Design an enzyme around this catalytic site. Structure first.
Site, mmCIF file in Angstrom:
data_model
loop_
_atom_site.group_PDB
_atom_site.id
_atom_site.type_symbol
_atom_site.label_atom_id
_atom_site.label_comp_id
_atom_site.label_asym_id
_atom_site.label_seq_id
_atom_site.Cartn_x
_atom_site.Cartn_y
_atom_site.Cartn_z
ATOM 1 N N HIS A 119 0.803 -1.223 0.000
ATOM 2 C CA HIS A 119 0.000 0.000 0.000
ATOM 3 C C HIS A 119 0.842 1.282 0.000
ATOM 4 O O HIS A 119 0.318 2.373 0.218
ATOM 5 C CB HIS A 119 -0.980 -0.006 1.160
ATOM 6 C CG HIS A 119 -1.831 -1.233 1.215
ATOM 7 N ND1 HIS A 119 -1.505 -2.293 2.012
ATOM 8 C CD2 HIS A 119 -2.970 -1.515 0.538
ATOM 9 C CE1 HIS A 119 -2.445 -3.195 1.812
ATOM 10 N NE2 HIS A 119 -3.356 -2.771 0.927
HETATM 11 C C1 DBT Z 1 -13.847 -6.158 -0.328
HETATM 12 C C2 DBT Z 1 -12.429 -6.650 -0.007
HETATM 13 C C3 DBT Z 1 -11.403 -6.019 -0.945
HETATM 14 C C4 DBT Z 1 -10.078 -6.709 -0.790
HETATM 15 C C5 DBT Z 1 -8.963 -5.689 -0.755
HETATM 16 C C6 DBT Z 1 -7.619 -6.355 -0.480
HETATM 17 C C7 DBT Z 1 -6.832 -6.327 -1.755
HETATM 18 C C8 DBT Z 1 -5.405 -6.761 -1.610
HETATM 19 C C9 DBT Z 1 -4.458 -6.042 -0.973
HETATM 20 O O1 DBT Z 1 -4.729 -4.828 -0.381
HETATM 21 C C10 DBT Z 1 -3.041 -6.534 -0.874
HETATM 22 O O2 DBT Z 1 -2.251 -5.830 -0.286
HETATM 23 C C11 DBT Z 1 -2.760 -7.799 -1.488
HETATM 24 S S1 DBT Z 1 -1.206 -8.567 -1.503
HETATM 25 C C12 DBT Z 1 -1.941 -9.847 -2.398
HETATM 26 N N1 DBT Z 1 -3.250 -9.731 -2.675
HETATM 27 C C13 DBT Z 1 -3.721 -8.542 -2.149
HETATM 28 C C14 DBT Z 1 -5.103 -8.090 -2.254
HETATM 29 O O3 DBT Z 1 -5.971 -8.712 -2.817
HETATM 30 S S1 FES Z 2 1.591 -0.594 3.298
HETATM 31 FE FE1 FES Z 2 -0.154 -1.869 3.574
HETATM 32 S S2 FES Z 2 0.991 -3.529 4.326
HETATM 33 FE FE2 FES Z 2 2.723 -2.227 4.047
#
Ligand code: DBT
Ligand code: FES
Ligand code: CDL
Ligand code: CDL
Ligand code: PC1
Ligand code: PC1
Ligand code: HEC
Ligand code: HEC
Ligand code: HEC
Ligand code: HEC
Ligand code: HEC
Ligand code: UQ6
Ligand code: UQ6
Lengths: 385, 93, 246, 55, 61, 125, 385, 49
Positions: free
Chosen positions: E27
């Site tokens: 993120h």
């Molecule tokens: C309604 C739920 C929405 C799901 C959001 C999560 C999405 C999401 C992330 O934020 C992430 O950091 C990673 S690392 C591998 N897969 C994911 C993923 O699917």
């Molecule tokens: S920034 Fe979301 S897990 Fe590191």
């Protein structure tokens, strides 16, 4: 009208559990149905939680169950509940079925109700068996071997269906893994079948011990029978508790605490107690094909009862000859079970053969003959000309 | 069975609509109609009409979003190239 | 993100297997296997491929049997319990150069040569990427690039710094079928063989696809016609209103 | 189309004739496809490579 | 330190980001050369585990 | 949103010559772009009827208007399913697009509002 | 009466599939529902057959999927069908949902119908995610890590719920095994929820593109719509076929062909395409707690629409301003998805933040404002006083 | 070994008992296999391989 009546979802609950008109005179024998729903829930819940820790691979199955027994918090409670629960599921089912037999619950207009029930019984046997194979103990392996081989009796393709079912040369890793997948699936089919059972029950309602109409005096399911059901639910739990905590392995087999071995079949094989009567019937026919056909027929013959019961009144409450023979049938069934736990030896083989005869004769000869005789007796005892 | 709640839809014979009178319908069996081939010459120029009235409601919002996307993308590319490493240090942190 | 970080985009080479109606070139698969055995196998394992899968694809039943027997595998213990070895059989899986991850790193400056069984499906770019990486090592890195000790520069690899040196050089392999073993010819071959390793069902999958798409297309067209027929009465239906008198 | 009225005569095709035709179709179609497919890839297949090999 | 991003658990990438440290690709959290949170959704600095020294080696535990 | 509220705002705008000359021309353009008239419908035919106010209103509507509403609605569904529009000479004209149900809707809303008011009246001694 | 009407089981089928009165004017947008049932079946069937060959252990999960790909006859067809089927399941669901948004299907008296649908959407997201974790590739592991950590945002107990969900110190062998057990369970809950959806639909029936009553001109479901449904069912299959046989991995991620690694998170993580819009919303809030709350709110806000739609007519068919803004909302959603596939870099972060604003503003500001304005326009364009 | 602690022996006693046996440890920095004394997490070893 009340919200419970108008809401699309609540009205279903209201019509089946709250306002459902019940015959004022039903007895505790009518409490087995709810007990069967409870059993179904207990089996599904404890099963899903164990599935979280279970491995279906043939090299890990047995040990993963031991892992559930030794490492999982409250794991042994889950396994003993699931295992002993299956047995209690059958004890209650037999009583549910016997109750139907005795009171003529299988009669018109509840034939559909009775036929769906037979299907459920078959699905339950299949389910428990598949679960049994998942432990992969000595009994598991041979059971998986015997039951799958049951299909080789079919002419021409039979041995093919078998190698197909196994997914190989013998009961192996493709077998146990597909059995686990299947053991998880079937319970949800039973649930759907249980709903159809209830739908069929709702159109004409429950019968009663007098065997006559209940339309002149009914009382709401809510309060009266909800609280009466509670009485047997607690009694059912007390007894199951005694086995789970104080005698968890009394209804099992020691050979299942030994990992399955493809090269050695135990010197003494005694199947699950609820399959014994069927095991005895199978063993009593000195022919392979005829042996399996007669066993399957022991279950399908239940379908014949609505036609062979020639009586003009429903149930055995006011019938001397029928009550007597009803119990011959019950104890004959227990006997078949006792024969199944014995070795194929002299007095037993002939006893097994006669008991099998009696079992089928009840449905095909005794009931139609006796019911006809009773019809006539009822007539000539009052007509004066 | 148990009494049912009032809805806004019934069933054949008591659908819930208002009493109809004066309306007369006519129809011809599909069996007596020209085999499917006449959906041209007479039914071709008439078609595509139900999209000449709508495409604007779809095109404008699409256009708006496409340019917005293209703009921000081209800006990103510049920021991370050599020419923009100066402006990148300005807008970044 | 800077181009050096993303990595140079691999261009599109005209692989004979590209296209809905195209099978792999099995001669190329065969050659590729040799390049893998004589060059790559020194550092790369191919754990998911079983000897038997080569039979009827790139080699004969006999050829594969000979190849498998040159390697030793652990056999079942003898009558007394002492361990013993055994030659390879068709049921076995192609063995790797290292016994464990630690020994693999020790032999490569601390880097871990990944298993190539799925490499073609485990990287954006697929064949185009693998080929481009193998034939894209410049003699000298671009001006200004401070390349770490023990590393190599390749523009197609993200970040430019890769722990694998160039290993393909002209005529380092004597192709059994006579073909000139130039570096590009060899890269073109291993990659094809690596594509087959990752997608062994390839040829068959595309054949089944052709059948499936023809039936469904036909079914789709047919349904439209049937629907129109069944609807004609409603579609051409006509109404007339005659206001009822009070 | 009078070609239809000669085999089925103003009636629809029945399940039996449908099932029967399906079994015939399945075999004919599969051969037609495997053929066209192998011919299109002539020179690339193992069959073709095995011939150019001698051991 | 523990290479567990304090946001939602991913493992920060070494020698990346805008603060000469680590960057979480999940993120977009940036950490500095001390492993402190500088930018992004992560609320805390990379946690430090208990450790002692013993000559040429450290014993994490 | 109630029709009583729609009328309040709409009437206020309609009376003031400031807004009345500014808005109405826009509203007229809006109504033509809507296109419901090309399907033979009057705006009042489009009001969602699944609520008590509208059921009371449609029940009080005189016979002749009711049979007409019925014909318009059926005719609309048939044209829609054919993916055409009615021939221009069959389109509802602006003079015809009258709020025929509106007076019944407003009467019912006032009756309803009064009952709500009366069921909750407080008393001061 | 006809047997299909009198039989207890057949009447259900008759009332829902055969004699059900449908509005004569519904268009192909009303065909998505059946397509959703089909998807549900395809997912359950292909899933059970693969479960026969799958091992949930963390040391065998990845390889067992490869085993399904390389050794199981027709195995790759099963996996590509299941995988690509999940994607097609969402493409069709969005169209089903968008159709409802555009025609005011969420309006009274179909609020219950709309709310049950929101629950199904949530259950489907949860199901696909759990399935995603079963492959145990690189994306799987980190996804399992991120989503389970989502719960640590809860004050006080949050980190506990997480270690509980994991069954240990991190995403490990107790995690993936419980995820498999759960992935198998949830689809049957969706099925039951789909039945409640249909029950709610049956009481008032389908709406139509004109937004008005259908009671004056209905035609039987049987024949007309059964055959019209067939048209899209085949088209749906043709397209799915093209991906399954010709481009099976286009909708997946290459990183999932790499076994999960607890110590290394991929340099570029791009979640499943159908989760991207939600991933972008999460990423746009520089606060942990507020980040997860806003994401969940992106789904729950769908519940608000029956109250914020102030219009007096159902649907956008005859509404200029509403149609226009409807499409701003659609393309804004696609944009959010595109932002989700990009790196957290300069023009993108601000674009993501504005798009998120627009998304919520549609439900809370634009719809109520626009619908009110349109109500007035409709009035002053015809009243002459 | 751990299951013995608090049942039939003290934490210390079991630790001493487990350490008298050798188990396969993780390979060294170079790949060569190496042994290691036992810990509470291990399972009581058997007389035959
Ligand atoms: C309604 C739920 C929405 C799901 C959001 C999560 C999405 C999401 C992330 O934020 C992430 O950091 C990673 S690392 C591998 N897969 C994911 C993923 O699917
Ligand atoms: S920034 Fe979301 S897990 Fe590191
Ligand atoms: C190794 C082999 C092991 C074998 C394992 C055993 C199998 C267990 C599996 C199933 C267990 C749960 C099932 C419980 C219900 C089954 C019994 C049943 O249906 O009997 C109905 C039957 C019908 O009763 P009714 O005509 O409706 O009742 C009028 C009541 O007096 C009307 O009165 P009431 O409602 O006002 O109050 C009624 C009554 C209600 O009591 C009840 O709980 C309901 C009926 C239970 C009777 C006891 C069954 C014995 C089970 C052990 O409450 C009482 O005061 C009676 C107390 C009876 C003693 C119960 C035993 C306590 C044991 C503690 C341990 O009750 C009996 O008469 C029982 C007959 C014995 C049958 C045994 C055959 C099974 C083998
Ligand atoms: C990397 C990204 C990849 C993207 C993946 C794509 C996503 C696929 C997932 C879902 C796929 C299955 C879904 C199929 C249905 C979806 C379409 C839909 O609901 O449109 C209704 C919509 C409503 O039609 P209507 O008002 O009820 O129809 C009056 C008909 O003329 C009334 O006439 P009719 O019943 O007498 O006959 C109607 C018509 C019925 O045709 C149909 O099959 C039904 C409607 C399909 C239109 C084509 C959609 C394009 C999909 C690709 O049959 C025809 O002759 C029309 C042929 C149209 C060409 C279809 C393409 C052939 C491609 C071969 C490959 O049909 C359209 O106008 C389509 C608008 C385009 C929307 C695309 C947005 C989705 C993105
Ligand atoms: C349905 C009707 C039930 C019929 C069942 C009655 C079976 C009781 C048999 C008594 C017996 O000898 O069981 C031996 C069997 C086994 O005997 P066995 O296994 O010990 O015989 C030889 C084996 N070795 C050498 C290892 C000792 O015990 C069971 O598994 C069943 C006991 C519980 C029965 C449950 C009935 C509850 C209702
Ligand atoms: C719901 C709305 C959908 C929004 C999704 C549109 C996303 C398309 C993004 C284009 C892109 O760059 O994808 C890159 C991503 C990944 O890019 P990436 O993974 O290559 O970036 C860096 C990684 N390395 C260094 C390995 C190259 O491709 C996908 O996984 C998605 C492509 C299919 C999208 C499906 C949409 C069909 C409907
Ligand atoms: C040992 C001396 C090697 C030989 C011989 C070959 N490869 Fe290699 N390879 C090696 C290492 C140490 C690495 C790691 C690189 C890193 O920086 O992590 C690799 C990696 C690859 C990869 C993966 C690259 C990626 O995109 O991540 C590929 C595709 C690859 N190697 C292919 C390959 C082939 C086909 C070879 C024979 C022609 C070959 N390698 C030889 C070490 C060595
Ligand atoms: C996955 C969910 C699941 C469901 C649903 C389920 N089971 Fe099981 N069952 C298991 C697992 C896991 C085992 C293996 C562990 C064990 O031995 O108890 C098992 C084992 C069994 C066994 C062997 C008991 C023994 O001796 O160890 C039987 C018998 C059984 N199940 C019966 C049933 C019946 C009857 C039902 C339902 C009516 C059912 N199961 C439903 C998972 C389930
Ligand atoms: C056990 C039955 C079972 C059911 C029921 C089931 N699945 Fe799965 N699913 C699996 C198994 C086994 C895997 C792992 C194999 C694989 O990757 O396809 C899987 C994997 C997945 C994956 C990962 C696909 C990939 O990339 O490999 C997704 C996504 C998924 N399921 C979605 C669904 C959806 C959505 C449904 C139902 C609506 C569903 N599944 C129902 C068994 C099931
Ligand atoms: C072979 C027969 C059969 C089987 C097995 C069967 N039922 Fe029944 N069931 C009946 C009959 C017949 C009745 C009607 C009883 C009456 O009114 O006389 C009945 C009635 C019921 C009732 C009403 C109350 C009662 O006990 O009379 C319930 C609840 C019920 N069954 C539940 C179930 C459930 C749950 C299962 C098993 C999963 C099941 N049944 C299996 C035959 C069966
Ligand atoms: C968030 C909303 C939502 C979701 C998700 C949802 N539905 Fe619906 N569904 C609706 C609404 C609203 C209607 C009423 C449509 C109308 O008549 O305008 C509907 C109608 C239907 C219909 C009638 C035909 C049609 O397409 O209009 C079917 C069948 C149906 N849904 C099936 C499903 C199935 C199966 C799923 C998913 C497993 C599903 N729905 C999920 C909202 C939803
Ligand atoms: C006419 O006569 C009647 C009569 O009609 C009735 C209804 C009754 C009363 C009895 C019943 C209604 C019995 C009914 C039983 C059922 C409907 C059972 C249905 C069964 C199921 C197994 C439901 C399925 C359950 C699940 C899918 C969920 C379980 C799993 C969970 C919660 C997993 C949770 C996971 C995590 C990680 C927390 C009578 O006593 C009676 O006598 C006169
Ligand atoms: C009012 O408007 C309507 C309308 O009402 C309807 C109903 C439809 C038609 C569409 C539908 C009815 C869709 C319905 C879908 C469902 C009910 C799906 C239910 C789902 C399931 C997943 C069932 C569960 C399946 C199983 C338990 C079995 C699968 C597994 C098997 C067979 C394993 C076999 C194993 C071995 C070893 C051989 C319309 O088109 C419509 O438009 C106007």
């Amino acid at each position: 009208m009340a919200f419970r009546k108008s809401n699309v979802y609540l009205s279903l609950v209201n019509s089946y559990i709250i306002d459902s008109p019940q015959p004022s005179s039903i007895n505790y024998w009518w409490n087995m149905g709810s007990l069967l729903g409870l059993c179904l829930v207990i089996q599904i819940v404890t099963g899903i939680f164990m599935a979280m820790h279970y491995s279906s691979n043939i090299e890990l199955a047995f040990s993963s169950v031991e892992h559930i027994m030794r490492d999982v918090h409250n794991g042994y409670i889950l396994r003993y509940l699931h295992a002993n629960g299956a047995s209690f599921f059958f004890m209650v089912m037999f009583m549910h079925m016997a109750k139907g037999l005795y009171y003529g619950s299988y009669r018109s207009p509840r034939v559909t109700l009775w036929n769906v029930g037979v299907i459920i019984f078959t699905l339950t046997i299949a389910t428990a068996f598949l679960g049994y194979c998942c432990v992969y103990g000595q009994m598991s392996h041979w059971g998986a071997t015997v039951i799958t081989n049951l299909f080789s009796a079919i002419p021409f393709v039979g041995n093919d269906i078998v190698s197909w079912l196994w997914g190989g040369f013998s009961v192996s890793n493709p077998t146990i893994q597909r059995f686990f997948a299947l053991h998880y699936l079937v319970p949800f089919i039973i649930a759907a079948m249980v709903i159809m059972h209830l739908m069929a029950l709702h159109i004409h309602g429950s019968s009663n011990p007098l065997g006559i109409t209940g339309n002149l005096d009914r009382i709401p399911m809510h309060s009266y029978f909800i609280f009466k059901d509670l009485v047997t639910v607690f009694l059912f739990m007390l007894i199951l508790a005694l086995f789970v905590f104080y005698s968890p392995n009394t209804l099992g087999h020691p050979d299942n605490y030994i990992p399955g071995n493809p090269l050695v079949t135990p010197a003494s094989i005694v199947p699950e107690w609820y399959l014994l009567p069927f095991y005895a019937i199978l063993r009593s026919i000195p022919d392979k094909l005829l042996g399996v056909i007669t066993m399957f027929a022991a279950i399908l013959v239940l379908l014949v009862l609505p036609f062979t019961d020639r009586s003009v009144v429903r149930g055995n409450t006011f019938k001397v000859l029928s009550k007597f023979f009803f119990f011959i049938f019950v104890f004959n069934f227990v006997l078949l079970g006792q024969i199944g736990a014995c070795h194929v030896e002299v007095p037993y083989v002939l006893m097994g053969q006669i008991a099998t005869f009696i079992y089928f004769a009840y449905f095909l000869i005794i009931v139609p003959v006796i019911s006809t005789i009773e019809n006539v007796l009822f007539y000539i005892g009052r007509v004066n000309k | 069975g148990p009494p049912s709640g009032k809805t806004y839809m019934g069933w054949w014979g008591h659908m819930g609509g208002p009493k109809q009178k004066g309306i007369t319908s006519y129809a011809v069996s599909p069996y007596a109609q020209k085999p499917l081939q006449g959906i041209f010459h007479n039914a071709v120029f008439n078609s595509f009409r139900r999209f000449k009235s709508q495409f604007l409601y779809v095109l404008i919002p699409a256009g708006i979003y496409w340019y917005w996307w293209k703009n921000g993308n081209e800006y990103n590319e510049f920021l991370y190239s050599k020419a923009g490493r100066e402006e990148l240090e300005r807008v970044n942190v | 993100m800077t181009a050096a970080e993303h990595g140079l985009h691999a261009p599109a080479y005209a692989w004979s297997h590209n296209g809905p109606f195209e099978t792999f070139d099995h001669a190329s698969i065969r050659r590729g296997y040799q390049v893998y055995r004589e060059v790559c196998a020194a550092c790369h394992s191919l754990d998911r491929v079983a000897w038997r899968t080569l039979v009827g694809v790139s080699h004969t039943n006999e050829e594969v049997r000979n190849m498998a027997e040159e390697f030793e595998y652990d056999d079942e213990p003898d009558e007394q319990g002492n361990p013993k070895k055994r030659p390879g059989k068709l049921s076995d899986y192609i063995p790797g150069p290292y016994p464990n991850e630690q020994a693999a790193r020790a032999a490569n400056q601390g880097a871990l040569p990944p298993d190539l069984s799925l490499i073609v499906k485990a990287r954006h770019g697929g064949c185009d990427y693998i080929f481009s990486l193998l034939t894209g090592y410049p003699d000298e890195p671009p001006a200004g690039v401070a390349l770490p000790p023990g590393s190599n520069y390749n523009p197609y690899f993200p970040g430019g710094s890769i722990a694998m040196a160039r290993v393909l050089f002209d005529d380092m392999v004597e192709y059994e079928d006579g073909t000139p073993a130039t570096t590009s010819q060899m890269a073109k071959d291993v990659t094809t063989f690596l594509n087959w390793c990752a997608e062994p069902e390839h040829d068959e999958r595309k054949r089944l696809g052709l059948k499936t798409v023809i039936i469904l297309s036909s079914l789709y067209l047919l349904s439209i016609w049937v629907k129109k027929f069944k609807w004609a009465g409603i579609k051409t239906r006509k109404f007339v209103f005659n206001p009822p008198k009070p | 189309s009078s070609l239809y009225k000669t085999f089925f005569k103003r009636n629809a095709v029945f399940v039996g004739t449908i099932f029967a035709g399906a079994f015939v179709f399945q075999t004919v179609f599969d051969t037609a496809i495997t053929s066209w497919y192998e011919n299109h890839n002539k020179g690339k297949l193992w069959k073709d490579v095995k011939a150019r090999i001698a051991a | 330190m523990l290479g567990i991003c304090t946001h939602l658990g991913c493992v920060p990438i070494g020698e990346a980001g805008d603060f000469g440290g680590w960057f979480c690709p999940c993120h977009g959290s940036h950490y500095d050369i001390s492993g402190r949170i500088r930018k992004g959704p992560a609320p805390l600095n990379l946690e430090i585990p208990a450790y002692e020294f013993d000559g040429d080696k450290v014993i994490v535990g | 949103q109630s029709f009583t509220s729609i009328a309040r705002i709409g009437d206020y705008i309609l009376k003031s010559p400031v807004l009345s000359k500014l808005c109405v021309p826009v509203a007229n353009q809006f109504i033509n772009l809507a296109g419901y008239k090309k399907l033979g419908l009057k705006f009042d035919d489009l009001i969602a009827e699944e609520n008590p106010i509208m059921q009371t209103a449609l029940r009080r509507l005189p016979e002749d208007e009711s049979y007409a509403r019925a014909y318009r609605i059926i005719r609309a569904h048939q044209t829609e399913l054919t993916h055409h529009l009615l021939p221009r000479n069959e389109w509802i004209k602006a003079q015809e697009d009258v709020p025929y149900l509106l007076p019944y809707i407003l009467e019912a809303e006032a009756a309803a509002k009064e009952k709500d008011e009366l069921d909750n009246i407080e008393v001061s001694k």
